[PDB]
Design an enzyme around this catalytic site. Sequence first.
Site, PDB file in Angstrom:
ATOM      1  CE  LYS A  93      49.918 -18.474 -16.633  1.00 61.78           C
ATOM      2  NZ  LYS A  93      50.387 -19.897 -16.353  1.00 61.78           N
ATOM      3  NE  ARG A 121      49.405 -13.348 -16.989  1.00 60.85           N
ATOM      4  CZ  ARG A 121      49.258 -14.603 -17.403  1.00 60.85           C
ATOM      5  NH1 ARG A 121      50.308 -15.319 -17.777  1.00 60.85           N
ATOM      6  NH2 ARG A 121      48.051 -15.157 -17.425  1.00 60.85           N
ATOM      7  CE1 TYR A 144      47.561 -18.556 -11.349  1.00 63.98           C
ATOM      8  CE2 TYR A 144      46.682 -20.682 -11.962  1.00 63.98           C
ATOM      9  CZ  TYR A 144      47.239 -19.482 -12.313  1.00 63.98           C
ATOM     10  OH  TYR A 144      47.487 -19.213 -13.649  1.00 63.98           O
ATOM     11  CE1 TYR A 185      48.633 -23.688 -14.476  1.00 64.55           C
ATOM     12  CE2 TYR A 185      46.385 -24.471 -14.274  1.00 64.55           C
ATOM     13  CZ  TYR A 185      47.408 -23.982 -15.044  1.00 64.55           C
ATOM     14  OH  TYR A 185      47.170 -23.785 -16.388  1.00 64.55           O
ATOM     15  CG  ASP A 232      48.632 -25.202 -25.209  1.00 64.63           C
ATOM     16  OD1 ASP A 232      49.362 -26.221 -25.195  1.00 64.63           O
ATOM     17  OD2 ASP A 232      47.973 -24.823 -24.205  1.00 64.63           O
ATOM     18  CG  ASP A 278      47.630 -26.124 -18.603  1.00 67.38           C
ATOM     19  OD1 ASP A 278      48.876 -26.238 -18.690  1.00 67.38           O
ATOM     20  OD2 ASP A 278      46.945 -25.345 -19.307  1.00 67.38           O
ATOM     21  CE1 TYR A 331      43.026 -17.400 -16.505  1.00 69.57           C
ATOM     22  CE2 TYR A 331      45.152 -17.482 -15.412  1.00 69.57           C
ATOM     23  CZ  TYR A 331      44.322 -17.869 -16.436  1.00 69.57           C
ATOM     24  OH  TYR A 331      44.830 -18.759 -17.351  1.00 69.57           O
TER      25      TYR A 331
HETATM   26 MG   LIG Z   1      50.410 -24.842 -18.590  1.00 63.31          MG
END
Ligand SMILES: [Mg+2]
Lengths: 175, 175, 175
Positions: free
Chosen positions: B30, B44, B52, B56, B66, B71, B140
């Site tokens: 990730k 991580r 995935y 992404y 956030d 995303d 996940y």
């Molecule tokens: Mg993101």
Amino acid sequence: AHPWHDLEIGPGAPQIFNVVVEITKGSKVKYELDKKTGLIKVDRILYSSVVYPHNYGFVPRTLCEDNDPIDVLVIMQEPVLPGCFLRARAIGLMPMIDQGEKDDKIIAVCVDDPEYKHYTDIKELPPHRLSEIRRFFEDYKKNENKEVAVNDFLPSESAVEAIQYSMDLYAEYIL
Amino acid sequence: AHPWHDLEIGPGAPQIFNVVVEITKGSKVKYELDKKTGLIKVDRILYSSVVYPHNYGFVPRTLCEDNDPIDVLVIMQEPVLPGCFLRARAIGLMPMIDQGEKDDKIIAVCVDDPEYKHYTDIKELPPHRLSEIRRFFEDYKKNENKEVAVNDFLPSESAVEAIQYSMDLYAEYIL
Amino acid sequence: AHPWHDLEIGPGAPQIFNVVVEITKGSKVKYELDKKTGLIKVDRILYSSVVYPHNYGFVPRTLCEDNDPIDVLVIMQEPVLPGCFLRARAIGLMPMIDQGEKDDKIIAVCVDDPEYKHYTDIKELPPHRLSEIRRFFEDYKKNENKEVAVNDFLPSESAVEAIQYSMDLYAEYIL
Ligand SMILES: [Mg+2]
Ligand SMILES: [Mg+2]
Ligand SMILES: [Mg+2]
């Protein structure tokens, strides 16, 4: 951001620190940071049918006697790509000599890898892992007719002391 | 160029826009953009034997609640490498909750992929594709003991509205 | 460092020079340098079931009539990742026409690859290699309904002259 100069070493240094990966586990391509530009360059293709045993790179804002940042081999579950960085804990030190010059390597784990993040010393590793690592550095330049002697591994505290010293040298020889 | 701040969103925004890839289809690593430096970092290694389902990443010059850019999951023929960007069309929106916090994802296609460039809505996709995507985000982080609830997908116009709002938030909270 | 403008061409230019790789041997993804940002972008996914026959990229601080830096195909043992650079020797020139526009390619080897670093001319290569390369460029845009004519390869001195000219054009059309 220049990955040597501009990326922070990480709040937890010298115990925990960022590592900029140059070479992915399993690679025959010896990539290196180009110090002037901050880009990744092909230094060479290895001269033997060998591959890096683990992800491999350097710590930002460090400096050794060879005028490079300190080298780190990062044990973990997954390959990591050149130019990306990760957080690592030093767990041992591998002293070695490359053609009469000091070239010690840090042995580390990725603290964000659920499998390896709990290791704190190389004595916790399956011993074959250490045997393979040592043998790699004794082998990988043989066919370049370059001499590499590797000595016995040292504990995590020796690695932490190496990192700290390389932090100091960087801070001194900056401006 | 810093890929969040310096890369343009693309003339066609909010309908069509650049996406900076962080994670390649099939990866267990990730990766994430490091906001301060613009480098790619290992956040991580996933805690489950999952990968995935698609490439992404994030959209430049966007901002969500956030404090991250928005995303995007990009459906296409081929894996794309972290740090590279591509042109994408929003075709749906997947609302979800990560430990009580909003974390909605855009579903997109690459407009330069001859196979997928003609999709304009997620209802055009084989439904299993949507089932696998939803299940991935429900799965996940399970082994991190983190709770992720995913809601029903919304159409392309909902995605376009999300993108536009995130453009506005970025423009506001800049300087 | 911007890889087109800030990376040096290399002291040995025009004979030996840095090459910034855009596309890895075996890839179906046609990555390209984004000139404005210096980032790597997906230009498109190839429209045929074809792959680049070798690592492929461009030379820093060069400029051609198509307003791009000069293109180079680098023959070597190993795949190289987009955004990384390497040192190469020009060993031949492949003239071609892409929809009525000049689009000549340099054929090169990596001077740090122990297998290929001793090649100085394309006539030293197994001839099939040249046949496959030519055929790739005749094939790879066919399914885009774009016309690509490739002419007979020229020797290393023709390639060196092309590089030198592109150095000159860059120096002229800078500021
Ligand atoms: Mg993101
Ligand atoms: Mg090093
Ligand atoms: Mg080009």
